[PDB]
Amino acid sequence: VGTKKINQRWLGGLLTNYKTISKRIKRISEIEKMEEDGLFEVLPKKEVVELKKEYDRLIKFLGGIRDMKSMPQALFVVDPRKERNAIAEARKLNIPIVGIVDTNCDP
């Protein structure tokens, strides 16, 4: 649970803000599923290209998770001074942080 610069763009939440980020991963599981019962050209052309942009940004800036069903019990970060908003929630969720110490920050 964590990457280097989960591919990029750690958002403001996704651990302790789960209940409205559950709607995002269920929307990825929605918009993968509703291609097959009729998606193209029963709508206008000016919605399906931003639907493909929503499917691209929900697998690019989210990263690589899809089956995150609840809160994981640990974090595995590499860079703990770029991911300061990632290491600040786990002290409030009572779960330990495991990270490679970079300069002065500690997990």
- Return the range that interacts with RNA (CB under 7 A); candidates 15-23, 30-38, 73-81, 97-105: 15-23
Nearer to RNA, 24 or 72 (CB): 24
Task: Pick left, alpha or beta for residue 38 (phi over 0 → left; psi -120 to 50 → alpha; otherwise beta).
Answer: left
Check if the beta carbon of residue 107 is closer than 8 Å to that of residue 80.
yes
Binding mask 63-92 for RNA (x = CB under 7 A): ---------------------xx--xx--x
Separation of CA 99 from chain center: 19
Look-up of token digits 């500690």: 106
Positions touching RNA (CB under 7 A) are: 8-13, 16-17, 19-21, 23-24, 45-46, 50, 53, 57-58, 61, 84-85, 88-89, 92
